[PDB]
Amino acid sequence: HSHGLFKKLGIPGPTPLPFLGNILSYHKGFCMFDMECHKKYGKVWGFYDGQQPVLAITDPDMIKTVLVKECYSVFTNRRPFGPVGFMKSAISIAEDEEWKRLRSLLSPTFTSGKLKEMVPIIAQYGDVLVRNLRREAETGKPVTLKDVFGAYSMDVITSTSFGVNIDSLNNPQDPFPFFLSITVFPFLIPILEVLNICTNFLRKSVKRMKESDFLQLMIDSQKALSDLELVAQSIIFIFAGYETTSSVLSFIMYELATHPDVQQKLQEEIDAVLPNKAPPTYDTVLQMEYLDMVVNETLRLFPIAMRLERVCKKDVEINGMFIPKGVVVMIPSYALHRDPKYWTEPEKFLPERFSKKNKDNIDPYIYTPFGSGPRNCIGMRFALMNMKLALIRVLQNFSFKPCKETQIPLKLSLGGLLQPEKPVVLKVESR
Amino acid sequence: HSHGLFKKLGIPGPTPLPFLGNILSYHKGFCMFDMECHKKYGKVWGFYDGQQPVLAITDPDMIKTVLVKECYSVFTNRRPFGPVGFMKSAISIAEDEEWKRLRSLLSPTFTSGKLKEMVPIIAQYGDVLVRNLRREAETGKPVTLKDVFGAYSMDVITSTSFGVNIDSLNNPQDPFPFFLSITVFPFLIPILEVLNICTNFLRKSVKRMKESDFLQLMIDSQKALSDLELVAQSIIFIFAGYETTSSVLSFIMYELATHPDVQQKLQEEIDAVLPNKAPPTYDTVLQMEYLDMVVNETLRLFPIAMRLERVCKKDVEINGMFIPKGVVVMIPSYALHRDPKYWTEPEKFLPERFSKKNKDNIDPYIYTPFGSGPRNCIGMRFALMNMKLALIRVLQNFSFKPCKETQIPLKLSLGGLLQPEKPVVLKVESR
Numbered sequence: 001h002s003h004g005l006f007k008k009l010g011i012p013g014p015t016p017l018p019f020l021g022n023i024l025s026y027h028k029g030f031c032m033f034d035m036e037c038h039k040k041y042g043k044v045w046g047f048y049d050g051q052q053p054v055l056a057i058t059d060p061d062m063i064k065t066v067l068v069k070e071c072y073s074v075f076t077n078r079r080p081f082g083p084v085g086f087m088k089s090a091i092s093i094a095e096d097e098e099w100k101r102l103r104s105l106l107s108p109t110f111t112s113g114k115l116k117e118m119v120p121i122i123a124q125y126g127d128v129l130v131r132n133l134r135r136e137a138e139t140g141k142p143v144t145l146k147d148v149f150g151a152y153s154m155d156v157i158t159s160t161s162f163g164v165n166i167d168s169l170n171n172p173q174d175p176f177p178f179f180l181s182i183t184v185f186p187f188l189i190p191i192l193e194v195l196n197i198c199t200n201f202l203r204k205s206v207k208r209m210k211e212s213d214f215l216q217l218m219i220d221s222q223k224a225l226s227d228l229e230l231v232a233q234s235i236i237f238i239f240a241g242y243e244t245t246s247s248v249l250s251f252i253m254y255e256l257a258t259h260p261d262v263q264q265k266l267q268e269e270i271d272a273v274l275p276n277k278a279p280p281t282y283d284t285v286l287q288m289e290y291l292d293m294v295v296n297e298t299l300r301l302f303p304i305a306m307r308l309e310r311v312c313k314k315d316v317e318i319n320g321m322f323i324p325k326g327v328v329v330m331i332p333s334y335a336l337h338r339d340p341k342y343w344t345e346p347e348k349f350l351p352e353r354f355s356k357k358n359k360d361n362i363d364p365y366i367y368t369p370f371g372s373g374p375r376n377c378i379g380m381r382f383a384l385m386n387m388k389l390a391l392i393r394v395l396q397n398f399s400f401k402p403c404k405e406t407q408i409p410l411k412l413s414l415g416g417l418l419q420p421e422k423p424v425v426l427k428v429e430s431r
Numbered sequence: 432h433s434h435g436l437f438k439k440l441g442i443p444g445p446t447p448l449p450f451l452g453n454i455l456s457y458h459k460g461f462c463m464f465d466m467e468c469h470k471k472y473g474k475v476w477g478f479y480d481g482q483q484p485v486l487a488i489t490d491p492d493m494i495k496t497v498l499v500k501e502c503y504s505v506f507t508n509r510r511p512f513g514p515v516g517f518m519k520s521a522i523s524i525a526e527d528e529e530w531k532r533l534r535s536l537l538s539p540t541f542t543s544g545k546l547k548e549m550v551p552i553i554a555q556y557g558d559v560l561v562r563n564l565r566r567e568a569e570t571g572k573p574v575t576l577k578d579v580f581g582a583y584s585m586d587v588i589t590s591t592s593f594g595v596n597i598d599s600l601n602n603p604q605d606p607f608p609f610f611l612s613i614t615v616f617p618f619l620i621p622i623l624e625v626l627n628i629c630t631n632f633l634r635k636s637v638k639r640m641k642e643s644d645f646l647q648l649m650i651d652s653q654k655a656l657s658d659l660e661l662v663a664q665s666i667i668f669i670f671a672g673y674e675t676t677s678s679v680l681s682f683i684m685y686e687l688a689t690h691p692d693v694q695q696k697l698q699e700e701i702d703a704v705l706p707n708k709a710p711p712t713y714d715t716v717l718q719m720e721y722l723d724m725v726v727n728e729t730l731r732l733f734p735i736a737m738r739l740e741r742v743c744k745k746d747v748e749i750n751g752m753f754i755p756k757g758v759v760v761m762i763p764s765y766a767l768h769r770d771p772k773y774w775t776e777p778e779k780f781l782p783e784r785f786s787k788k789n790k791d792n793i794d795p796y797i798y799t800p801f802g803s804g805p806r807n808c809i810g811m812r813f814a815l816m817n818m819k820l821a822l823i824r825v826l827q828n829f830s831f832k833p834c835k836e837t838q839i840p841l842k843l844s845l846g847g848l849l850q851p852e853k854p855v856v857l858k859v860e861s862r
């Protein structure tokens with residue numbers, strides 16, 4: 001019934017099938033859908049996830065309008081996500097006024113100082129990361145990167161926010177389809193919101209963080225903060241600092257392997273700023289510009305978010321286009337990062353895109369790997385530091401080459417989340 | 432899970448059973464529940480319709496705060512009602528900005544002038560109402576009031592808004608449980624919102640009001656007005672002008688019958704202002720004060736709405752009480768109209784409560800038969816005029832006495848909506 005909203009507004013888009021909308025088109029993944037749609041319809045198009053209208057925009061001013069200018073007023077919240085349960089109070093899932101309070105309460109966790117407090121602490125598990133890697137390198141056995149990176153990433157997040165120290169080769173107490181049917185049956189979300197389909201593992205263990213850091217800064221600031229809400233924020237932070245940190249690290253190492261000129265040119269800078277394999281510090285990391293380039297260029301090819309979303313909470317007319325209340329506005333971050341109308345040879349890995357000679361010819365509303373505006377990635381600065389500190393210690397000791405079973409070229413997960421089809425396996429040699 | 436919100440806030444209320452909340456207590460009707468709860472817990476209490484917290488308030492300043500002071504900001508919308516379908520666009524069901532536009536677009540329908548245009552037109556079907564009554568009076572047969580009143584009321588609404596003239600003794604083309612399960616399964620509302628469970632009778636007939644009045648004033652003002660939205664507003668107006676007008680008229684005549692001193696004292700005023708059985712006009716109706724008293728006192732005993740409701744759309748602290756977002760605030764209009772801490776002998780029918788000698792000792796936030804603030808009854812003035820014009824022509828010609836089968840004392844419908852258990856049947860004699 002509601003499948004004529006874009007036929008009405010004169011906005012092009014793929015013809016939706018009843019009930020399904022255009023979800024059958026996701027058979028190649030969200031990214032191949034947005035890339036094709038970006039070609040088919042232009043700067044603006046609209047489709048339907050079930051009965052839910054999605055408006056895709058690609059205009060830098062419209063994107064600046066949505067994510068920044070009209071954030072607090074109209075585009076405060078993301079698509080409703082359920083069933084969540086108590087996790088409705090998580091910052092990334094909370095809406096309107098409740099989200100504003102959580103954003104203020106958790107913002108001072110990633111100040112330039114609180115991050116600088118974390119550099120002496122992060123410098124530990126990188127040496128566990130090297131020593132765990134020196135074992136699988138002295139034996140000529142190819143290495144699953146996400147295993148030893150995730151083992152590292154998990155070690156970082158548990159201490160940077162709480163303080164628990166665990167080598168992630170022994171028992172790691174941290175375990176963690178149908179979401180398609182959720183889009184045809186979003187009416188089933190409130191259904192599952194009563195049968196408590198939301199494990200009690202950390203729901204009582206992290207709840208029993210009696211402690212009698214991020215965990216410190218929460219009870220210290222407790223219209224204040226709750227406790228079951230404190231657990232939910234811990235779950236969000238623990239996931240992000242693990243999966244996002246590890247997945248991107250595998251992405252970077254795959255590119256350094258298939259582009260050995262970029263791997264050596266980066267190794268030459270690390271030994272320069274840090275001679276005699278010096279331990280990386282807060283200020284020596286921010287000095288390395290080629291490392292910043294390699295990180296940014298990998299995030300162009302693999303923005304793990306793929307899409308930025310905002311629910312339009314009332315009728316508006318942004319940049320000369322009427323947008324009705326309830327529409328989910330979408331920024332195809334993946335399709336924008338590979339749009340040839342902005343990037344030269346956009347499928348190629350070229351870190352020189354982000355050189356200070358060329359970093360000005362890049363629109364920060366086309367390149368948006370961390371979002372933008374008041375609801376951008378809250379851990380953007382931390383994640384950049386945690387990854388870079390990891391990249392320094394690893395490349396200071398090991399080089400990386402492709403293996404026989406290394407998937408070249410890498411296929412993206414044609415499924416839901418931005419991951420590789422096959423895991424990233426590379427040979428590791430010792431310098 | 433959410434059954435501790437009032438246990439937390441220190442707000443008293445009946446202990447909710449899981450899933451059901453306190454809906455089993457509705458076995459005597461909403462009114463006997465609110466009256467008892469008003470006694471048990473005092474100025475403020477809270478219960479649960481399923482999993483849905485309801486906060487009942489009785490404080491005149493708090494009521495003034497909710498319905499008027501913080502209407503546009505926090506208490507804009509009523510409880511979500513579904514499945515509705517296209518009727519989501521009806522003014523009484525629409526929310527926030529969409530409702531503001533509809534309220535402005537439909538407000539000038541009931542100006543003092545547009546109503547005055549309707550007095551010469553309403554004066555027709557009252558004579559059909561008398562002539563239909565003179566037949567069942569010359570025969571000594573008791574009369575079902577709501578039949579001949581509803582036949583009258585329907586005749587008024589179809590012409591006052593569109594223009595169609597029909598004696599309501601021939602075929603009337605206007606026909607019109609589980610809502611309890613809706614409260615335990617409000618998660619099922621979005622479910623039914625896709626299977627179009629919302630007849631096409633006027634959905635295409637009223638949609639085919641080509642006309643090529645309320646209907647006039649809609650296309651004339653067509654960020655403007657739509658057409659399927661035009662149908663929905665017609666359905667709302669047609670129901671209200673029928674059921675509310677007829678039901679209250681039966682209520683008034685029952686009270687005049689069981690209180691013949693009030694019936695004669697009212698008949699004496701009507702013949703005074705309108706001698707020689709003069710036709711009532713706009714200004715002769717507004718002059719009759721005892722008729723205004725009888726109308727108001729009946730609306731005290733039988734406020735057909737029973738309850739006023741507002742969804743609290745964000746955290747607030749009104750009159751020194753914190754109220755969390757999502758709570759449905761409720762004004763027990765029925766229980767307030769019979770509260771002995773404001774009314775003397777509140778079960779007795781005493782029109783002298785509203786005499787200009789005593790109409791000042793009445794708080795207009797305790798007596799709220801039409802709501803209050805920007806979202807009060809939009810047809811308040813019209814309905815008062817339509818009923819009073821009907822009461823004049825009827826009492827000018829007939830007196831009313833109780834019958835053998837007349838339910839004395841009247842039992843209210845222990846069910847959902849404010850109606851009598853048995854229909855109102857009274858003997859009609861000719862003056």
Ligand code: HEM
Pocket residue numbers: 067091092093103236237240241244245248299303304305308309368369370371372373374375376377378379380382383
């Ligand atoms: C390479 C690593 C990461 C990338 C590329 C990334 C990217 C993003 C993006 C694109 C968004 C959405 C922004 C928007 O919609 O405008 C986001 C949100 C968010 N990120 Fe990250 N992120 C990363 C790591 C992290 C880390 C380490 C944390 C640790 C706490 C984190 C916490 C969050 C939270 C809480 C949100 C939701 C913010 C809100 O709704 O207010 N992320 N991230």
Ligand code: HEM
Pocket residue numbers: 498522523524534667668671672675676679730734735736739740799800801802803804805806807808809810811813814
């Ligand atoms: C004796 C007759 C009537 C009584 C006692 C009555 C009472 C009420 C009450 C108590 C409300 C809710 C106000 C609030 O929540 O604050 C309401 C709303 C409403 N009434 Fe009436 N009403 C009557 C007749 C009518 C008539 C004849 C119409 C014709 C159009 C009408 C149209 C409406 C509408 C559209 C609303 C919803 C207003 C909104 O949501 O903005 N009513 N009425």
Ligand SMILES: O=C(N[C@H](CS[C@H](Cc1ccccc1)C(=O)NCCCc1cccnc1)Cc1c[nH]c2ccccc12)c1cccnc1
Pocket residue numbers: 078081090092093179235236239240244304305307308309377
């Ligand atoms: O994963 C989606 N997330 C949100 C809705 S809640 C989700 C809840 C969650 C918590 C923990 C683990 C998985 C899921 C969440 O809290 N995730 C951020 C936390 C980690 C993180 C990841 C990346 C960067 N930083 C931090 C929409 C979204 C759209 N675009 C985004 C971009 C970035 C972050 C979130 C979003 C999504 C999954 C499937 C279907 N629909 C939505």
Ligand SMILES: O=C(N[C@H](CS[C@H](Cc1ccccc1)C(=O)NCCCc1cccnc1)Cc1c[nH]c2ccccc12)c1cccnc1
Pocket residue numbers: 509512521523524610666667670671675735736738739740808
């Ligand atoms: O009937 C409820 N109505 C609303 C929700 S939508 C309802 C939709 C409707 C339209 C037509 C016929 C029946 C129902 C509506 O449009 N009705 C006003 C129109 C007539 C009218 C009646 C009286 C006075 N004026 C005009 C809540 C409400 C709460 N208190 C009120 C007081 C007055 C009006 C509405 C409300 C209710 C029924 C069962 C369960 N929940 C809600």
